[PDB]
Design a protein around this ligand. Structure first.
Ligand SMILES: *C(=O)[C@@H](NC(=O)Cc1ccccc1)[C@@H]1N[C@@H](C(=O)O)C(C)(C)S1
Length: 442
């Protein structure tokens, strides 16, 4: 294996993983020049612990044993020249990836836990895939057995779990980002932006003693009722609870399926955890589901796709991480074909969601806003866990830009909201999302 030069993983004409000839018993050492930043993409290639992410998924291409490559390897052996693996050109934009990483390291009064996903809505290209904290795959590329095992042990016991790709492997309550799905369900059912909903600071749940309140216990406005548009841009809870229950369990399940939930995701070639709306066993649950709580659980990737789908006029592009596979001579072996996965909503519903989202962006805290770029977004702050009231919530932000003709869609998850009980998506996640947007549009 190691007597032969393994091929490269690339992004934007830059190397993410390469192999270097050494005096080692195993000649070739695998090197990762920007290790923690790209670990979610590259994975690691280890003597002791095998391969992960694209090292693994694209292993036959990279080691030159792929059937489409094997002729070249045979000509190399016969001819006498040194064998070389093939190349994997990813869809990652290094400027967008770096910006997502940097902003997550800086944006929680110190480093954030969580993920950043950037997508090109019209193609499905995964432009960034950041998880935090990360780890150094060079540690596991070491040819020393004790260096690998010590690093493995350390990473394994680290309760922050830096090995986890939080972008695609983990699911979290979306909280109020899911108001996008509730609203879409409502609109498809014939509800309008002018629909009058409760402004009440609190709402009881049917068939339970529990109550759901607005953030800070404040009424949505000073009038008895507000328009759906106004409830959405202010992100008032009781209105969406009322709306969700009005719209009903079947329509919401249905709309969630339409946006890719409760369907097994296609590999990118990396496997993506399945997102869900939950069973919604009763109307108490429906009310909670409506604001992205109860059993709703999404990957940051799925939440970025929701944004991307709206950005694409209601058509979900199949998301993918590999743009092309190449020979060691860089002859084309495989170019990825972009694919329309399904239509989630009519262009008209997508246009109305875009309108609502632009409004919710103007309302949200304004840190990191880019002069002359119109952003559509939805913030969220999701309670979680066995002691949710005493546990810091996740700060979420999904968005796309420019709102009129989108070039990028993002999701930002700040898991546990910088260890603050008063964490919000607008305060933590939104400026991270905006910096990624700015990097993508530069
Ligand atoms: C959606 O995320 C809502 N979040 C809060 O209600 C947190 C919460 C508290 C108790 C139970 C369940 C959830 C609203 N949306 C966010 C947001 O837009 O970021 C607000 C903080 C504005 S409240």
């Amino acid at each position: 294996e190691y007597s032969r030069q393994r091929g490269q993983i690339t992004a934007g004409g830059q190397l993410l993983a390469y192999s270097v000839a050494t005096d080692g018993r195993f000649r070739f050492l695998r090197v990762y020049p920007n290790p923690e930043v790209y670990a979610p993409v590259t994975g690691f290639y280890s003597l002791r612990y095998s391969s992960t992410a694209l090292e693994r998924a694209e292993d036959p291409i990279l080691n030159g044993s792929d059937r489409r490559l094997f002729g070249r390897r045979l000509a190399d052996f016969f001819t006498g020249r040194d064998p070389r693996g093939g190349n994997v050109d990813t869809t990652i934009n290094p400027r967008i990836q770096q910006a997502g990483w940097d902003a997550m390291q800086q944006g929680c009064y110190g480093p954030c836990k969580g993920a950043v996903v950037a997508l090109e809505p019209s193609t499905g290209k995964i432009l960034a895939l950041v998880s935090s904290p990360s780890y150094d795959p060079n540690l596991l590329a070491s040819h020393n057995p004790e260096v690998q095992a010590q690093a493995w042990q350390r990473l394994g016991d680290n309760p922050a779990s830096p090995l986890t790709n939080r972008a695609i492997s983990e699911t979290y309550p979306p909280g109020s980002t899911f108001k996008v799905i509730t609203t879409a369900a409502a609109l498809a059912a014939g509800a309008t932006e002018t629909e009058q909903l409760t402004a009440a600071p609190t709402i009881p749940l049917p068939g339970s003693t529990a109550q759901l309140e607005n953030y800070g216990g404040a009424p949505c406005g000073d009038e008895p009722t507000v328009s759906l548009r106004e409830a959405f841009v202010k992100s008032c809870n009781t209105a969406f609870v009322q709306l969700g229950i009005r719209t009903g369990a079947d329509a919401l399940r249905s709309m969630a399926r339409a946006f890719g939930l409760d369907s097994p995701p296609r590999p990118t070639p990396l496997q993506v955890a399945e997102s869900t709306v939950g069973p919604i066993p009763d109307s108490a649950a429906l009310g909670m589901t409506s604001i992205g709580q109860k059993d709703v659980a999404l990957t940051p990737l799925a939440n970025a796709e929701i944004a991307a789908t709206i950005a694409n006029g209601g058509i979900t592009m199949r998301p993918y991480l590999v743009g092309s596979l190449k020979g060691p001579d860089l002859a084309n072996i495989s170019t990825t074909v972009r694919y329309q996965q399904r239509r989630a909503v009519s262009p008209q519903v997508a246009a109305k969601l875009t309108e609502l989202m632009v409004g919710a962006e103007k309302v949200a805290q304004q840190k990191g806003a880019i002069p002359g770029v119109q952003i559509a977004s939805k913030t969220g702050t999701a309670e979680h866990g066995t002691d949710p009231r005493h546990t810091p919530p996740h700060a979420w932000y999904i968005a796309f830009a420019p709102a009129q003709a989108p070039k990028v869609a993002v999701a930002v998850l700040v898991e546990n909201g910088a260890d603050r009980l008063s964490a919000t998506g607008g305060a933590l996640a939104a400026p991270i999302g905006r910096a990624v947007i700015e990097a993508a549009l530069q």
